[PDB]
Amino acid sequence: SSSVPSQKTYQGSYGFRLGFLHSGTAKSVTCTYSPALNKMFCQLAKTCPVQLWVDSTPPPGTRVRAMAIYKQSQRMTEVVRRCPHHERCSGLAPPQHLIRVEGNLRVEYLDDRNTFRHSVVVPYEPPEVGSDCTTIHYNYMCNSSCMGGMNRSPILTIITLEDSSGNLLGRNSFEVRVCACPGRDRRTEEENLRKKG
Amino acid sequence: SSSVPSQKTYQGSYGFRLGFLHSGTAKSVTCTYSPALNKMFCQLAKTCPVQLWVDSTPPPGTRVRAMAIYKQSQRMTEVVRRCPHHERCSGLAPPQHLIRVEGNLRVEYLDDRNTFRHSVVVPYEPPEVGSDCTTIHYNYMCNSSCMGGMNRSPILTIITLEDSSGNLLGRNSFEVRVCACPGRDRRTEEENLRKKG
DNA sequence: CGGGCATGCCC
DNA sequence: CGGGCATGCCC
Ligand SMILES: [Zn+2]
Ligand SMILES: [Zn+2]
């Protein structure tokens, strides 16, 4: 069986979608999201808020898993891991894991025994009784350019909503560039899309 | 006592000097030496020949030690080591050592018990009975830019001629930039010296 | 090969 | 903060 997890969007019967905060115009804004490119540009180790939107209320015990995969065919079959430098200069998160969660008391970090892929899971909590979404705070512990890790290869983060029995209820994904200057780099990429895409 | 080794030139009673091969004009020549800057520009893990010149013949049992130090005050007191990536993706040389020697059957790699500095030592052999110098082949296992290692800080390589009793007979040093394009980068630096130095 | 993009950092 | 150098890599 394949060790490449699926990345296909499956908004599913709960109408699961992700949302992202608007950000300021700064060259080096800490986290910014491009809707045109479905891509988050963010700094390493800094907070990246991701909203979970649903139309119907998931069952008790639903879980939210995040996993990184390389976006291009060239590396899709390789596990995305933290580079040796940021592993050394590393809480609960194992030091080889790229994605950490902040702000949650029931995070689990998983290393798949068969595929060796890392993921990090938190309980699904429904929005607070006005809010329309639930926010989870992720961090990415390397820049996309880290040699010996991502090494300039783009990743997708895949966010799956799973029930406690393991059924896939919903799946969404977004591309990530972890970088020193998220505002510069988002604008560059959007302009490249318009000119050459 | 100070854990910063001396870097002062001491050509000493044997008239010890270093020499370096001339190289071609290629942007990405593997090894090239600037006399104006007393600086070797070279690629990582590739052969860097360094000649030892003496006016008088060192005693039997003389040893040739090479050691890297950071050239600037900012890092001079820090030990120069291979970055975590090139340590992982690593023979006789310990994987934390930046400088390796090729082509010699009696290399010793040393980790100083007091200063924690690395060095690599080979027996001094007098030139073959026409030659005027003895060549040792070094390699540097990271680029000067490796994050988690040199991290763009310039190094000096200090080459000492020592007798078997430990007396310092001679000392010379040269700056090193380990880089993808030694020819480009040597020309850049020489031009910066002329314009702004 | 040499031109020119890349992208964390300038200090 | 935004301009612009850095430097391994383009694929
Ligand atoms: Zn890293
Ligand atoms: Zn290195």
Give the separation between CA A178 and CA B138, rounded to whole angstroms.
Answer: 36
User: CA of A146: which chain B residue's CA is closest?
Assistant: B147
- Tell me how far the alpha carbon of residue A22 is from its chain's centroid: 17
Give the separation between CA A93 and CA A96, rounded to whole angstroms.
Answer: 8
Instruction: Give all strands of the β-sheet with B134-140 in edge-to-edge order.
Output: B17-19, B48-53, B134-140, B99-102
Shortest CA to C1' contact from B29: nucleotide:
C1
Whether CB of A145 is under 7 Å from strand C: the answer is yes
B150 touches chain A (CB under 8 A): no
Whether CB of A139 is under 7 Å from strand C: the answer is no
B85 touches chain A (CB under 8 A): yes
Measure B80 CA to ligand 1 centroid, in angstroms.
20
Whether CB of B107 is under 7 Å from strand C: the answer is no
* Residue A81: closest CA among A1, A73, A90: A90
b/e B145-183 (16+ beta carbons within 10 angstroms → b): bbbbbbeebebbbbbbbbeeeeeebbbbbbbbbbbeebb
For chain B, what is the HEC assignment? CCCCCCCCCECCCCCCEEECCCCCCCCCCCEEEECCCCEEEECCCCCEEEEEECCCCCCCCCEEEEEEEECCHHHHCCECCCCHHHHHCCCCCCCCCCEEEECCCCCEEEECCCCCCEEEEEECCCCCCCCCCEEEEEEECCCCCCCCCCCCCCEEEEEEEECCCCCEEEEEEEEEEECCCHHHHHHHHHHHHHHHC
Tallying the residues shown for chain A, one arrives at 197
Measure B146 CA to ligand 1 centroid, in angstroms.
12
A99 touches chain B (CB under 8 A): no
Contacts of B104 (CB under 8 A, 6+ apart): B122, B136, B137
A83 touches chain B (CB under 8 A): yes
CATH architecture assigned to A1-197: Sandwich (2.60)
Measure A88 CA to ligand 1 centroid, in angstroms.
10
Q: How many CB atoms lie within 10 A of CB A136?
A: 22
CA distance A83 to chain B (A): 7
Nearest to A88 among B89, B146, B148 (CB): B148
**8 Å CB contact of B87 and A89:** no
Measure A152 CA to ligand 2 centroid, in angstroms.
16
User: CA of A142: which chain B residue's CA is closest?
Assistant: B147
Written as six digits, the tokens of B42 are 């070279």
Interface residues 22-51 of A with strand C (CB < 7 Å): none
Residue by residue, DSSP assigns A40-96 as EEE-TTS-EEEEEE-SSPPPTT-EEEEEEEESSHHHHTSBP---HHHHHT---S-TT
User: How were these coordinates obtained?
Assistant: X-ray
Provide φ and ψ at B125, rounded to 5°: -120, 130
In strand D, the nucleotides that come within 7 Å of a protein beta carbon are 1-4, 6-10
A88 touches chain B (CB under 8 A): yes
Enumerate the known binding-site residues of B for Zn(2+): 83, 86, 142, 146
Looking at the C1' of nucleotide C8, which residue has the nearest alpha carbon? A180
A83 is in an annotated binding site: yes
Domain locations along chain B: 1-197
| A84 chain-B contacts, CB cut-off 8 A | 83-85, 87-88, 148
Give the separation between CA B148 and CA B98, rounded to whole angstroms.
Answer: 13
CA distance B134 to chain A (A): 37
| B146 and B43 Cβ atoms separated by less than 8 Å | no
Chain position carrying tokens 């090479």: B66
